[PDB]
């Protein structure tokens, strides 16, 4: 059993990634009210805890951080604000967990659109790192593979 | 052969049955069927012939008695108000809709040319042989464009379609019969609740008018008068369900109210002529903390960088653009203002001009600011946003755990009942897309955070350790009483407040707590286990009876993931499977409020909480209480 957590600001594609990993948009209908909604098997079972839609509820991310074991720090490349927001979340994990080091991954979602892009690759290099895309299936599985390794 | 197929079912010989079956193997409409079903059809398929082009096979609005397969020739599919919608040719079949749904014919079938031959299966034989196997997926076409997809998942349900065709289908299949009075109020409910996503009132109201006045083009005078009357009765049912759904919210829609006032006059005038609508006209006459309306006005303070402010008078549903204009009015401006939300912790968000009803989307201690873009980074919070500096233990410690929980649940119920089912829809699909307020939902969702931070605030403002252990004991008790009243929302809010980093840190406080309450809390903390899609909570809430307040953040999550997980449009048609899913989740709230719920000093405290929502402040307070 493993528990992975998807963190980030709104409009970043957290939910799009989660569904695209566990099941897939369009190909099948997505029911988020059943036991296996966020569970997938890869040989180990993954439970994705996503803060999508609950961002205003600070207690919800904390509960997810406490139960988590791997963390996906997702941002968008169409929004300057979202990479700036990642500093706080990084530290907030290292306070609920009460540990010194936590296995995590940085994710730069929405790479498929370059004509609207305002952020660069440069910024996320130093703090793994992917320029994934949920809607274009780029690096979707990669995100959740790395966390199980770590 | 034709004489053979004209013979009644119980008159055909074994050799007749064998020769027919061979021919059924050449019909593509029957190719998907099993050998068992096909030989049952050999003794059931009647041959029918008509010579004259323009002969009407059946009328729209008639009860369906037969399913047809075209051998020779072609037919027109005619729908009232549209005329010839499409043509069916050699090898095509029709008429299964009325038989499966037990509903009137959705269209008229008229001969296109001379000398047409049909294979027919009557009602009793269709239900026995074909009902479970024939036409499980039906995609209707109009002008060579796909217009509706029905699937047998027992009647057909709408999988996808155009807004117009979906409405047409839901009208046609309204059950008028008095014994079936709630079995229709549940089928229509999906459409009535969800239409605003794919067919707003600007389209729906004209469509309803056109449907109400649509006359039949087929049948004798009596037949036509009957078809039109039932059509009119069905439209009225829809309008009643639509008006009931919106309730007081119609005041925000001038088009919807103008329609309802004109519709009522039309029904009244028709009732004076036809002596009908006796049951439905008086019901239509009735329609023609309190919930906040979008048309209500607020006196809202918008602050400048120097911390002076302007009080603006605008509607609750006003856009950021209207807010900017109101500030620019009072201050006198042509200097490019932006509106920005700010937290107690200095965190800032620039609001788009597009954003509507932003006043209630603020954090507990958030304020609204107006400034040019270059002032953005220099903005600093108001002292008022930082919350209280002394506790209120002296006040609420003198109050009963049971009384606090009761007054909390009473107040939570007032707030929960103020929320409209449609506000959940607007919130999910995005406020700006509807220009409607979600103010009632926004304030009720905010209360979760208010209760959470109340706990953290009071614990962190309690300097005496012995009293702090008494606080933890009290909050645990208040949480337990909230769970008894089936107020699961406030229950989880208190437990999460206890789980806060600032509170959980206090080892000397937690250690000195009786093992009874340490046991209690451990059970509460396991109820919020996220494992297997919050299985622990979901089962707890499933056991409970109707009058209950659900864990709201999880409801919002379900709603978010239904929307992002599923597409609204498939193949350019409305994905009604998705619409149905959203509707079920919203009706979940209707189920929770279906039953009613069973000390002015205690009422006052609970409804006027003062809270620190600045996490950094609360941590600093905690770190000086127990280093
Ligand atoms: N676009 C369409 N709308 C309605 N009915 C159609 C359409 N195309 C074909 N039909 C067939 O016409 C039949 C008219 O009677 P039923 O409602 O029993 O079943 C209907 C369908 O089988």
PDB file of N, CA and C in Angstrom, chain B residues 80-82 163-172 174 188 191-193 195-196 198-215 228-246 250 253 255-264 266-267 270 277 284:
ATOM      1  N   UNK B  80     -43.810  17.566 -34.955  1.00  0.00           N
ATOM      2  CA  UNK B  80     -44.595  18.798 -34.896  1.00  0.00           C
ATOM      3  C   UNK B  80     -43.713  20.010 -34.607  1.00  0.00           C
ATOM      4  N   UNK B  81     -43.797  21.011 -35.482  1.00  0.00           N
ATOM      5  CA  UNK B  81     -42.989  22.221 -35.366  1.00  0.00           C
ATOM      6  C   UNK B  81     -41.713  22.182 -36.189  1.00  0.00           C
ATOM      7  N   UNK B  82     -41.371  21.003 -36.712  1.00  0.00           N
ATOM      8  CA  UNK B  82     -40.141  20.811 -37.489  1.00  0.00           C
ATOM      9  C   UNK B  82     -40.392  20.254 -38.890  1.00  0.00           C
ATOM     10  N   UNK B 163     -29.330  20.273 -26.965  1.00  0.00           N
ATOM     11  CA  UNK B 163     -30.227  20.820 -25.941  1.00  0.00           C
ATOM     12  C   UNK B 163     -31.697  20.768 -26.362  1.00  0.00           C
ATOM     13  N   UNK B 164     -31.981  21.126 -27.614  1.00  0.00           N
ATOM     14  CA  UNK B 164     -33.350  21.110 -28.136  1.00  0.00           C
ATOM     15  C   UNK B 164     -33.985  19.724 -28.138  1.00  0.00           C
ATOM     16  N   UNK B 165     -33.225  18.725 -28.581  1.00  0.00           N
ATOM     17  CA  UNK B 165     -33.720  17.355 -28.672  1.00  0.00           C
ATOM     18  C   UNK B 165     -33.876  16.702 -27.298  1.00  0.00           C
ATOM     19  N   UNK B 166     -32.993  17.060 -26.366  1.00  0.00           N
ATOM     20  CA  UNK B 166     -33.065  16.569 -24.990  1.00  0.00           C
ATOM     21  C   UNK B 166     -34.352  17.063 -24.317  1.00  0.00           C
ATOM     22  N   UNK B 167     -34.654  18.351 -24.489  1.00  0.00           N
ATOM     23  CA  UNK B 167     -35.893  18.939 -23.979  1.00  0.00           C
ATOM     24  C   UNK B 167     -37.111  18.290 -24.626  1.00  0.00           C
ATOM     25  N   UNK B 168     -37.046  18.119 -25.946  1.00  0.00           N
ATOM     26  CA  UNK B 168     -38.115  17.480 -26.706  1.00  0.00           C
ATOM     27  C   UNK B 168     -38.402  16.079 -26.159  1.00  0.00           C
ATOM     28  N   UNK B 169     -37.341  15.326 -25.880  1.00  0.00           N
ATOM     29  CA  UNK B 169     -37.463  13.979 -25.336  1.00  0.00           C
ATOM     30  C   UNK B 169     -38.068  13.976 -23.932  1.00  0.00           C
ATOM     31  N   UNK B 170     -37.576  14.866 -23.072  1.00  0.00           N
ATOM     32  CA  UNK B 170     -38.065  14.951 -21.700  1.00  0.00           C
ATOM     33  C   UNK B 170     -39.504  15.454 -21.601  1.00  0.00           C
ATOM     34  N   UNK B 171     -39.919  16.290 -22.552  1.00  0.00           N
ATOM     35  CA  UNK B 171     -41.319  16.686 -22.654  1.00  0.00           C
ATOM     36  C   UNK B 171     -42.177  15.491 -23.042  1.00  0.00           C
ATOM     37  N   UNK B 172     -41.877  14.911 -24.204  1.00  0.00           N
ATOM     38  CA  UNK B 172     -42.616  13.772 -24.759  1.00  0.00           C
ATOM     39  C   UNK B 172     -42.878  12.641 -23.760  1.00  0.00           C
ATOM     40  N   UNK B 174     -43.002  12.786 -20.328  1.00  0.00           N
ATOM     41  CA  UNK B 174     -43.591  13.144 -19.037  1.00  0.00           C
ATOM     42  C   UNK B 174     -44.820  12.277 -18.797  1.00  0.00           C
ATOM     43  N   UNK B 188     -37.484  14.241 -14.806  1.00  0.00           N
ATOM     44  CA  UNK B 188     -37.363  15.639 -15.221  1.00  0.00           C
ATOM     45  C   UNK B 188     -36.364  16.421 -14.384  1.00  0.00           C
ATOM     46  N   UNK B 191     -32.892  17.141 -15.889  1.00  0.00           N
ATOM     47  CA  UNK B 191     -32.930  18.212 -16.884  1.00  0.00           C
ATOM     48  C   UNK B 191     -33.165  19.581 -16.243  1.00  0.00           C
ATOM     49  N   UNK B 192     -34.194  19.654 -15.403  1.00  0.00           N
ATOM     50  CA  UNK B 192     -34.620  20.895 -14.757  1.00  0.00           C
ATOM     51  C   UNK B 192     -33.501  21.532 -13.923  1.00  0.00           C
ATOM     52  N   UNK B 193     -32.732  20.694 -13.232  1.00  0.00           N
ATOM     53  CA  UNK B 193     -31.599  21.154 -12.435  1.00  0.00           C
ATOM     54  C   UNK B 193     -30.401  21.557 -13.291  1.00  0.00           C
ATOM     55  N   UNK B 195     -30.142  22.168 -16.802  1.00  0.00           N
ATOM     56  CA  UNK B 195     -30.306  22.894 -18.069  1.00  0.00           C
ATOM     57  C   UNK B 195     -29.406  24.126 -18.204  1.00  0.00           C
ATOM     58  N   UNK B 196     -29.178  24.837 -17.099  1.00  0.00           N
ATOM     59  CA  UNK B 196     -28.390  26.076 -17.114  1.00  0.00           C
ATOM     60  C   UNK B 196     -26.974  25.905 -17.664  1.00  0.00           C
ATOM     61  N   UNK B 198     -26.240  23.812 -20.339  1.00  0.00           N
ATOM     62  CA  UNK B 198     -26.271  23.572 -21.782  1.00  0.00           C
ATOM     63  C   UNK B 198     -27.400  24.290 -22.520  1.00  0.00           C
ATOM     64  N   UNK B 199     -28.417  24.712 -21.774  1.00  0.00           N
ATOM     65  CA  UNK B 199     -29.571  25.404 -22.340  1.00  0.00           C
ATOM     66  C   UNK B 199     -30.101  26.437 -21.345  1.00  0.00           C
ATOM     67  N   UNK B 200     -29.483  27.629 -21.313  1.00  0.00           N
ATOM     68  CA  UNK B 200     -29.938  28.667 -20.383  1.00  0.00           C
ATOM     69  C   UNK B 200     -31.336  29.206 -20.723  1.00  0.00           C
ATOM     70  N   UNK B 201     -31.980  29.836 -19.739  1.00  0.00           N
ATOM     71  CA  UNK B 201     -33.339  30.377 -19.870  1.00  0.00           C
ATOM     72  C   UNK B 201     -33.587  31.207 -21.132  1.00  0.00           C
ATOM     73  N   UNK B 202     -32.540  31.857 -21.640  1.00  0.00           N
ATOM     74  CA  UNK B 202     -32.630  32.648 -22.874  1.00  0.00           C
ATOM     75  C   UNK B 202     -33.005  31.793 -24.084  1.00  0.00           C
ATOM     76  N   UNK B 203     -32.697  30.499 -24.013  1.00  0.00           N
ATOM     77  CA  UNK B 203     -33.072  29.546 -25.054  1.00  0.00           C
ATOM     78  C   UNK B 203     -34.267  28.690 -24.640  1.00  0.00           C
ATOM     79  N   UNK B 204     -34.283  28.270 -23.375  1.00  0.00           N
ATOM     80  CA  UNK B 204     -35.301  27.357 -22.864  1.00  0.00           C
ATOM     81  C   UNK B 204     -36.702  27.952 -22.917  1.00  0.00           C
ATOM     82  N   UNK B 205     -36.836  29.194 -22.459  1.00  0.00           N
ATOM     83  CA  UNK B 205     -38.141  29.859 -22.404  1.00  0.00           C
ATOM     84  C   UNK B 205     -38.804  30.028 -23.785  1.00  0.00           C
ATOM     85  N   UNK B 206     -38.059  30.529 -24.799  1.00  0.00           N
ATOM     86  CA  UNK B 206     -38.609  30.533 -26.160  1.00  0.00           C
ATOM     87  C   UNK B 206     -38.978  29.136 -26.673  1.00  0.00           C
ATOM     88  N   UNK B 207     -38.169  28.134 -26.329  1.00  0.00           N
ATOM     89  CA  UNK B 207     -38.413  26.753 -26.739  1.00  0.00           C
ATOM     90  C   UNK B 207     -39.689  26.185 -26.116  1.00  0.00           C
ATOM     91  N   UNK B 208     -39.920  26.512 -24.844  1.00  0.00           N
ATOM     92  CA  UNK B 208     -41.117  26.070 -24.129  1.00  0.00           C
ATOM     93  C   UNK B 208     -42.385  26.680 -24.718  1.00  0.00           C
ATOM     94  N   UNK B 209     -42.307  27.962 -25.080  1.00  0.00           N
ATOM     95  CA  UNK B 209     -43.415  28.681 -25.711  1.00  0.00           C
ATOM     96  C   UNK B 209     -43.772  28.041 -27.051  1.00  0.00           C
ATOM     97  N   UNK B 210     -42.755  27.818 -27.882  1.00  0.00           N
ATOM     98  CA  UNK B 210     -42.923  27.170 -29.180  1.00  0.00           C
ATOM     99  C   UNK B 210     -43.516  25.768 -29.050  1.00  0.00           C
ATOM    100  N   UNK B 211     -43.104  25.034 -28.016  1.00  0.00           N
ATOM    101  CA  UNK B 211     -43.617  23.684 -27.770  1.00  0.00           C
ATOM    102  C   UNK B 211     -45.076  23.702 -27.340  1.00  0.00           C
ATOM    103  N   UNK B 212     -45.422  24.640 -26.458  1.00  0.00           N
ATOM    104  CA  UNK B 212     -46.784  24.773 -25.940  1.00  0.00           C
ATOM    105  C   UNK B 212     -47.812  25.073 -27.039  1.00  0.00           C
ATOM    106  N   UNK B 213     -47.443  25.920 -27.998  1.00  0.00           N
ATOM    107  CA  UNK B 213     -48.354  26.314 -29.078  1.00  0.00           C
ATOM    108  C   UNK B 213     -48.244  25.461 -30.345  1.00  0.00           C
ATOM    109  N   UNK B 214     -47.379  24.447 -30.321  1.00  0.00           N
ATOM    110  CA  UNK B 214     -47.202  23.559 -31.472  1.00  0.00           C
ATOM    111  C   UNK B 214     -48.425  22.669 -31.682  1.00  0.00           C
ATOM    112  N   UNK B 215     -49.000  22.730 -32.878  1.00  0.00           N
ATOM    113  CA  UNK B 215     -50.169  21.917 -33.206  1.00  0.00           C
ATOM    114  C   UNK B 215     -49.789  20.720 -34.070  1.00  0.00           C
ATOM    115  N   UNK B 228     -52.707  17.767 -28.819  1.00  0.00           N
ATOM    116  CA  UNK B 228     -52.349  19.128 -28.427  1.00  0.00           C
ATOM    117  C   UNK B 228     -52.592  19.391 -26.941  1.00  0.00           C
ATOM    118  N   UNK B 229     -53.695  18.860 -26.415  1.00  0.00           N
ATOM    119  CA  UNK B 229     -54.044  19.017 -25.002  1.00  0.00           C
ATOM    120  C   UNK B 229     -53.002  18.373 -24.086  1.00  0.00           C
ATOM    121  N   UNK B 230     -52.625  17.135 -24.401  1.00  0.00           N
ATOM    122  CA  UNK B 230     -51.633  16.403 -23.622  1.00  0.00           C
ATOM    123  C   UNK B 230     -50.243  17.016 -23.734  1.00  0.00           C
ATOM    124  N   UNK B 231     -49.909  17.496 -24.930  1.00  0.00           N
ATOM    125  CA  UNK B 231     -48.694  18.270 -25.143  1.00  0.00           C
ATOM    126  C   UNK B 231     -48.668  19.477 -24.205  1.00  0.00           C
ATOM    127  N   UNK B 232     -49.743  20.261 -24.233  1.00  0.00           N
ATOM    128  CA  UNK B 232     -49.891  21.429 -23.367  1.00  0.00           C
ATOM    129  C   UNK B 232     -49.799  21.075 -21.883  1.00  0.00           C
ATOM    130  N   UNK B 233     -50.432  19.970 -21.491  1.00  0.00           N
ATOM    131  CA  UNK B 233     -50.372  19.479 -20.113  1.00  0.00           C
ATOM    132  C   UNK B 233     -48.945  19.133 -19.690  1.00  0.00           C
ATOM    133  N   UNK B 234     -48.197  18.511 -20.602  1.00  0.00           N
ATOM    134  CA  UNK B 234     -46.805  18.130 -20.365  1.00  0.00           C
ATOM    135  C   UNK B 234     -45.876  19.334 -20.229  1.00  0.00           C
ATOM    136  N   UNK B 235     -46.048  20.326 -21.103  1.00  0.00           N
ATOM    137  CA  UNK B 235     -45.276  21.569 -21.025  1.00  0.00           C
ATOM    138  C   UNK B 235     -45.505  22.261 -19.673  1.00  0.00           C
ATOM    139  N   UNK B 236     -46.765  22.306 -19.238  1.00  0.00           N
ATOM    140  CA  UNK B 236     -47.135  22.894 -17.947  1.00  0.00           C
ATOM    141  C   UNK B 236     -46.431  22.190 -16.783  1.00  0.00           C
ATOM    142  N   UNK B 237     -46.402  20.857 -16.819  1.00  0.00           N
ATOM    143  CA  UNK B 237     -45.689  20.052 -15.826  1.00  0.00           C
ATOM    144  C   UNK B 237     -44.217  20.459 -15.738  1.00  0.00           C
ATOM    145  N   UNK B 238     -43.569  20.562 -16.898  1.00  0.00           N
ATOM    146  CA  UNK B 238     -42.175  20.996 -17.006  1.00  0.00           C
ATOM    147  C   UNK B 238     -41.982  22.366 -16.365  1.00  0.00           C
ATOM    148  N   UNK B 239     -42.836  23.314 -16.744  1.00  0.00           N
ATOM    149  CA  UNK B 239     -42.758  24.684 -16.237  1.00  0.00           C
ATOM    150  C   UNK B 239     -42.926  24.720 -14.714  1.00  0.00           C
ATOM    151  N   UNK B 240     -43.842  23.900 -14.196  1.00  0.00           N
ATOM    152  CA  UNK B 240     -44.058  23.792 -12.749  1.00  0.00           C
ATOM    153  C   UNK B 240     -42.829  23.256 -12.018  1.00  0.00           C
ATOM    154  N   UNK B 241     -42.201  22.232 -12.592  1.00  0.00           N
ATOM    155  CA  UNK B 241     -40.970  21.650 -12.054  1.00  0.00           C
ATOM    156  C   UNK B 241     -39.794  22.623 -12.130  1.00  0.00           C
ATOM    157  N   UNK B 242     -39.740  23.377 -13.223  1.00  0.00           N
ATOM    158  CA  UNK B 242     -38.728  24.401 -13.449  1.00  0.00           C
ATOM    159  C   UNK B 242     -38.873  25.559 -12.455  1.00  0.00           C
ATOM    160  N   UNK B 243     -40.098  26.058 -12.297  1.00  0.00           N
ATOM    161  CA  UNK B 243     -40.395  27.138 -11.351  1.00  0.00           C
ATOM    162  C   UNK B 243     -40.186  26.731  -9.887  1.00  0.00           C
ATOM    163  N   UNK B 244     -40.496  25.474  -9.564  1.00  0.00           N
ATOM    164  CA  UNK B 244     -40.294  24.946  -8.214  1.00  0.00           C
ATOM    165  C   UNK B 244     -38.808  24.861  -7.866  1.00  0.00           C
ATOM    166  N   UNK B 245     -38.007  24.425  -8.837  1.00  0.00           N
ATOM    167  CA  UNK B 245     -36.557  24.315  -8.694  1.00  0.00           C
ATOM    168  C   UNK B 245     -35.920  25.659  -8.348  1.00  0.00           C
ATOM    169  N   UNK B 246     -36.229  26.686  -9.137  1.00  0.00           N
ATOM    170  CA  UNK B 246     -35.672  28.023  -8.940  1.00  0.00           C
ATOM    171  C   UNK B 246     -36.210  28.698  -7.679  1.00  0.00           C
ATOM    172  N   UNK B 250     -35.909  33.151  -9.307  1.00  0.00           N
ATOM    173  CA  UNK B 250     -36.440  33.660 -10.578  1.00  0.00           C
ATOM    174  C   UNK B 250     -36.351  35.180 -10.681  1.00  0.00           C
ATOM    175  N   UNK B 253     -33.733  36.666 -12.798  1.00  0.00           N
ATOM    176  CA  UNK B 253     -33.845  36.404 -14.227  1.00  0.00           C
ATOM    177  C   UNK B 253     -35.103  37.057 -14.804  1.00  0.00           C
ATOM    178  N   UNK B 255     -35.904  37.505 -17.988  1.00  0.00           N
ATOM    179  CA  UNK B 255     -36.408  36.670 -19.077  1.00  0.00           C
ATOM    180  C   UNK B 255     -37.297  35.541 -18.540  1.00  0.00           C
ATOM    181  N   UNK B 256     -36.840  34.887 -17.474  1.00  0.00           N
ATOM    182  CA  UNK B 256     -37.571  33.782 -16.860  1.00  0.00           C
ATOM    183  C   UNK B 256     -38.898  34.226 -16.248  1.00  0.00           C
ATOM    184  N   UNK B 257     -38.898  35.404 -15.626  1.00  0.00           N
ATOM    185  CA  UNK B 257     -40.106  35.960 -15.019  1.00  0.00           C
ATOM    186  C   UNK B 257     -41.090  36.486 -16.058  1.00  0.00           C
ATOM    187  N   UNK B 258     -40.567  37.143 -17.092  1.00  0.00           N
ATOM    188  CA  UNK B 258     -41.384  37.617 -18.206  1.00  0.00           C
ATOM    189  C   UNK B 258     -42.079  36.446 -18.894  1.00  0.00           C
ATOM    190  N   UNK B 259     -41.344  35.349 -19.066  1.00  0.00           N
ATOM    191  CA  UNK B 259     -41.881  34.114 -19.626  1.00  0.00           C
ATOM    192  C   UNK B 259     -42.988  33.524 -18.758  1.00  0.00           C
ATOM    193  N   UNK B 260     -42.737  33.442 -17.453  1.00  0.00           N
ATOM    194  CA  UNK B 260     -43.668  32.816 -16.516  1.00  0.00           C
ATOM    195  C   UNK B 260     -44.975  33.597 -16.419  1.00  0.00           C
ATOM    196  N   UNK B 261     -44.874  34.921 -16.481  1.00  0.00           N
ATOM    197  CA  UNK B 261     -46.043  35.793 -16.451  1.00  0.00           C
ATOM    198  C   UNK B 261     -46.861  35.681 -17.738  1.00  0.00           C
ATOM    199  N   UNK B 262     -46.176  35.590 -18.875  1.00  0.00           N
ATOM    200  CA  UNK B 262     -46.845  35.408 -20.163  1.00  0.00           C
ATOM    201  C   UNK B 262     -47.420  33.995 -20.303  1.00  0.00           C
ATOM    202  N   UNK B 263     -46.677  33.001 -19.816  1.00  0.00           N
ATOM    203  CA  UNK B 263     -47.100  31.599 -19.855  1.00  0.00           C
ATOM    204  C   UNK B 263     -48.386  31.384 -19.063  1.00  0.00           C
ATOM    205  N   UNK B 264     -48.455  31.994 -17.882  1.00  0.00           N
ATOM    206  CA  UNK B 264     -49.632  31.913 -17.018  1.00  0.00           C
ATOM    207  C   UNK B 264     -50.888  32.488 -17.676  1.00  0.00           C
ATOM    208  N   UNK B 266     -51.365  32.697 -20.970  1.00  0.00           N
ATOM    209  CA  UNK B 266     -51.674  31.753 -22.047  1.00  0.00           C
ATOM    210  C   UNK B 266     -52.448  30.532 -21.554  1.00  0.00           C
ATOM    211  N   UNK B 267     -52.048  29.995 -20.402  1.00  0.00           N
ATOM    212  CA  UNK B 267     -52.730  28.845 -19.808  1.00  0.00           C
ATOM    213  C   UNK B 267     -54.132  29.231 -19.321  1.00  0.00           C
ATOM    214  N   UNK B 270     -56.408  29.655 -22.343  1.00  0.00           N
ATOM    215  CA  UNK B 270     -56.717  28.331 -22.889  1.00  0.00           C
ATOM    216  C   UNK B 270     -57.707  27.556 -22.021  1.00  0.00           C
ATOM    217  N   UNK B 277     -57.009  21.919 -17.588  1.00  0.00           N
ATOM    218  CA  UNK B 277     -55.954  22.371 -16.668  1.00  0.00           C
ATOM    219  C   UNK B 277     -56.507  22.769 -15.298  1.00  0.00           C
ATOM    220  N   UNK B 284     -50.029  27.001 -10.865  1.00  0.00           N
ATOM    221  CA  UNK B 284     -49.295  27.989 -11.646  1.00  0.00           C
ATOM    222  C   UNK B 284     -49.567  29.407 -11.139  1.00  0.00           C
TER     223      UNK B 284
END
